[PDB]
Amino acid sequence: QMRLPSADVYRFAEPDSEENIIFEENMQPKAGIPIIKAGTVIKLIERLTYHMYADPNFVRTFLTTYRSFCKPQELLSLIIERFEIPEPSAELKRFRKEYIQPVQLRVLNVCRHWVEHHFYDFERDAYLLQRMEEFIGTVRGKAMKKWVESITKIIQRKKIAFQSSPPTVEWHISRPGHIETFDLLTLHPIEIARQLTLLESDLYRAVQPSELVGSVWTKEDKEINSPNLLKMIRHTTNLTLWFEKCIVETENLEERVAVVSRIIEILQVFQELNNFNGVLEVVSAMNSSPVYRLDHTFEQIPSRQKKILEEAHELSEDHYKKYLAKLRSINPPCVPFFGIYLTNILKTEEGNPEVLKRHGKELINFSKRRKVAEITGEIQQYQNQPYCLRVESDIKRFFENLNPMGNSMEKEFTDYLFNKSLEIEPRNPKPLPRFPKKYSYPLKSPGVRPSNP
């Protein structure tokens, strides 16, 4: 039993009670550490920099989700307060080795981790970085110098700011460099899928937890706080709209059958590549009111492709049951569909209290924050691995600059798409009209199987 100073002098000395810290029945799966359910900010900071053992999971979780219950400037103050330990012989030499030195090292680990993985707090508050550099400068002694130097190297790096050969790029009617002829039917359907998988893979990888924690993509400053997520969602939306537009603007039935068939071939390749974002871009285009109603077009579609579309659609049925099952079964590289994560993070934050009350005292609900960090961690596990596919700068640029809406607002474009659907395939009993062909080039697909070894 070790003697710690009075809570009147050192706030983190106060003993544990139901009024300041509570736990879950389970223990850390691989570490045997108890799981904190809720506690006061002091008790959470005490356990972040605990003397008996290091708690990397709790540190990793905390620094991701603390901004709801504590400001960066307030966290720094708390960890500086924790480091500056007063004393309360045998007891005084033991306390120094078993309490002060371990706690001081744990505060420096927090600092190091914060700076390494959440430098945005410092980019957005230069005085926060001022106080952090100052504190680090005051740190002295052997054992600390090693960490103080490593932290100083990270700060300055943050201020400064791998496989075998990939497959051969595929070409169909459009030739390399002839960007003016690039379209859905002229580019090779394998390369449309690959180049879109490459854009969508980079977009997915760029989303950071700072854009998700606190459900900030749904708030008034979402354009400021969640820019990479929003670009990602907008590419996906642009691609769905382009697929719908390609379909309904192809008024000739035989050419429109060629268009739906080519989109299904692209979907097949997205399924091969595990680009589930791309799979849903296609599924969403097909379930849209302008596309879903085109029964004369679907009548002429080969059964192989119908079945391909049926399976892709079924990944979404029953609250994404099969999608979830399929994502767990595959291994990277893949491009997950982000929408599920966004709904689960939102509903976790909105469906659980920020605070629990025990014996009339407010405890920060940390388990709510852990649950969010589990989802942000799940998103990060698929951001590590890249695709072994070559970029084609012209095809890339063609998809980056797609603008099916043009200068029209959503409603105006959405109605244009639907009124086009009604024009090309009128509501029964109206007879099916015939429309002239618009494609000079041949409609036969080259297939989804590569041409060269």
Partner 1 sequence: HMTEYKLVVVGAGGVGKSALTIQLIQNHFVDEYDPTIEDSYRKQVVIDGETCLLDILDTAGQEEYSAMRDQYMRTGEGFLCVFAINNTKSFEDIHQYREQIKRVKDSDDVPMVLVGNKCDLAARTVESRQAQDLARSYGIPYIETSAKTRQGVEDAFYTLVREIRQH
Ligand X SMILES: CSc1nc(-c2c(C)cccc2C)nc(N2CCNCC2)n1
- 310 contact choice in partner 1, ligand X, none (CB below 5 to 8 Å, kind-dependent): ligand X
**Interface pick for partner 1 out of 109, 174, 210, 236 (rule CB under 8 A):** 236
CB of 264: closest distance to ligand X in angstroms?
7
CB of 406: closest distance to partner 1 in angstroms?
16
CB of 222: closest distance to partner 1 in angstroms?
8
Closer to ligand X at the Cβ: 298 or 398? Answer: 298
Q: What is the dihedral of CA 8, 13, 14, 20, to 10 degrees?
A: 130
- 215 contact choice in partner 1, ligand X, none (CB below 5 to 8 Å, kind-dependent): partner 1
Say if CB 150 and CB 115 are below 8 A apart: no
**Interface pick for partner 1 out of 237, 252, 383, 445 (rule CB under 8 A):** 237
244 touches partner 1 (CB under 8 A): yes
Nearest to 191 by CA among 255, 285, 265: 265
- 305 contact choice in ligand X, partner 1, none (CB below 5 to 8 Å, kind-dependent): ligand X
The span from the CA of 148 to the CA of 133, in Å, is 10
Closer to partner 1 at the Cβ: 142 or 319? Answer: 319
CB of 326: closest distance to ligand X in angstroms?
17
* Helix (H/G/I), strand (E/B), else coil: 230: helix
In the chain, what's the furthest Cα-to-Cα distance? 101
| Sign of the CA dihedral with 175 first, then 180, 182, and 186 last | negative
Closer to ligand X at the Cβ: 100 or 301? Answer: 301
289 touches partner 1 (CB under 8 A): yes
User: What x/- string results for residues 325 through 354 when contact with partner 1 is judged by CB under 8 A?
Assistant: --------------x--xxxxxxx-xxxx-
Closer to partner 1 at the Cβ: 82 or 371? Answer: 371
Residues that bind ligand X (CB under 6 A): 286-287, 292, 295, 298, 301, 305-306, 309-310, 313
Q: Residue 333: is the preceding peptide bond cis (ω within 30°)?
A: yes
At residue 115, φ and ψ (nearest 5 deg) are: -70, -40
Q: Which residues neighbour 145 within 8 Å (Cβ) at sequence distance 6 or greater?
A: none
CB of 292: closest distance to ligand X in angstroms?
5
CB of 244: closest distance to ligand X in angstroms?
11
Q: What is the DSSP string of 240-307?
A: HHHHHHHHHT--SHHHHHHHHHHHHHHHHHHHHHTBHHHHHHHHHHHHSHHHHT-HHHHHTS-HHHHH
Closer to partner 1 at the Cβ: 120 or 418? Answer: 418
Question: What per-residue string of b and e applies to 102-117 under the rule 16 or more CB within 10 Å gives b?
Answer: bbbbbbbbbbbbbbee
CB of 219: closest distance to partner 1 in angstroms?
6
**Stretch near partner 1 under the rule CB under 8 A, chosen from 15-23, 50-58, 232-240, 391-399:** 232-240
Residues in 104-143 that interact with partner 1 by CB under 8 A:
none
Closer to partner 1 at the Cβ: 38 or 108? Answer: 38
Chain breaks in the chain (C to N over 2.5 A) after: 88, 161
**Interface pick for partner 1 out of 50, 182, 416, 418 (rule CB under 8 A):** 418
Say if CB 438 and CB 252 are below 8 A apart: yes
- 225 contact choice in partner 1, ligand X, none (CB below 5 to 8 Å, kind-dependent): none
Say if CB 217 and CB 229 are below 8 A apart: yes
Other beta carbons within 10 Å of 388: 12
**Interface pick for partner 1 out of 287, 381, 385, 451 (rule CB under 8 A):** 287
The span from the CA of 25 to the CA of 97, in Å, is 31
Distance spanning both ends of the chain, measured CA to CA: 71
323 touches partner 1 (CB under 8 A): no
The span from the CA of 448 to the CA of 452, in Å, is 12
The span from the CA of 233 to the CA of 339, in Å, is 9
Residue ranges binding partner 1 (CB under 8 A): 215, 217-220, 230, 233-234, 236-237, 240-241, 244, 280, 283-285, 287-289, 292-293, 316-317, 319, 339, 342-348, 350-353, 371, 410-411, 418
